[PDB]
Design a protein around this ligand. Structure first.
Ligand SMILES: C[C@@H](/C=C/C(=O)C=O)NC(=O)[C@@H](Cc1ccccc1)NC(=O)OCc1ccccc1
Length: 215
């Protein structure tokens, strides 16, 4: 693999967003991966809609939870591959209550044709990411409310409970790390990002990695 990749340097990652009090991390994980994957297919970077998934994806549980994988499939299977612009379908669940789904008034800002699930092995995730772009991962985020910056080297690794977006890694640093886009505003961590040590399954990062595939 290359020694270091950071997809933010390529103009491929949109701004840090804010899930608020809704348990919608899954939606932010998956839509973040679709924004990136769409850019990489040769389109302008477009902000896309989590509210679409939170409100309309009935194969997931709204502000109670969901799986990035079900979100991918619901897009392809039930919404004709369409992902709405964030503009045409703004986030309205900051309070922990999602409104009812609306099937009109929106504009398509990306489409996808499916998703891949990556192996449970950090070296192999990194290989895939190096080439194909940012990846949705699940993590144990228990530790993460105390996080203020730097590379974290000890992470409570017991149960997956949060969905985030893996955007780069650096193997040449004193402690190899992953670069992870979180959805708790820019007020948290490194301007909305976290860096966690790579190679030791910090936060169970290898366990549930996957990506949308665009046309
Ligand atoms: C509550 C929410 C985000 C929460 C936070 O903001 C907590 O920090 N977590 C989730 O939605 C996800 C995180 C996750 C994603 C992928 C694999 C493993 C876990 N948790 C989650 O529990 O999904 C449950 C579920 C399963 C099937 C159908 C509906 C719901």
């Amino acid at each position: 693999a290359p020694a270091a990749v950071d997809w933010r340097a390529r103009g491929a990652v949109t701004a840090v967003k804010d899930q608020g009090q809704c348990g919608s991390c899954w939606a932010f994980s998956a839509i973040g991966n679709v924004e990136c994957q769409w850019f990489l297919a040769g389109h302008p970077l477009t902000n896309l809609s989590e509210q679409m998934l939170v409100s309309c994806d009935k194969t997931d549980s709204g502000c109670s939870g969901g799986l990035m994988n079900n979100a991918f499939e619901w897009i392809v299977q039930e919404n004709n591959g369409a992902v709405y612009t964030e503009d045409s379908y703004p986030y309205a669940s900051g309070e922990g209550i999602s409104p009812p789904c609306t099937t009109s008034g929106h504009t398509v800002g990306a489409t996808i044709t499916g998703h891949v699930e990556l192996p449970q092995d950090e070296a192999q995730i990194a290989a895939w990411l190096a080439v194909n772009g940012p990846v949705a991962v699940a993590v144990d985020a228990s530790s993460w409310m105390t996080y203020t910056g730097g590379v974290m080297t000890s992470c409570v690794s017991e149960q997956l409970d949060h969905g985030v977006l893996l955007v780069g890694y650096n193997d040449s640093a004193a402690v190899p790390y992953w670069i992870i886009k979180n959805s708790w505003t820019t007020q948290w961590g490194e301007e909305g990002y976290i860096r966690i040590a790579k190679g030791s399954n910090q936060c169970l990062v290898k366990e549930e990695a996957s990506s949308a595939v665009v046309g």
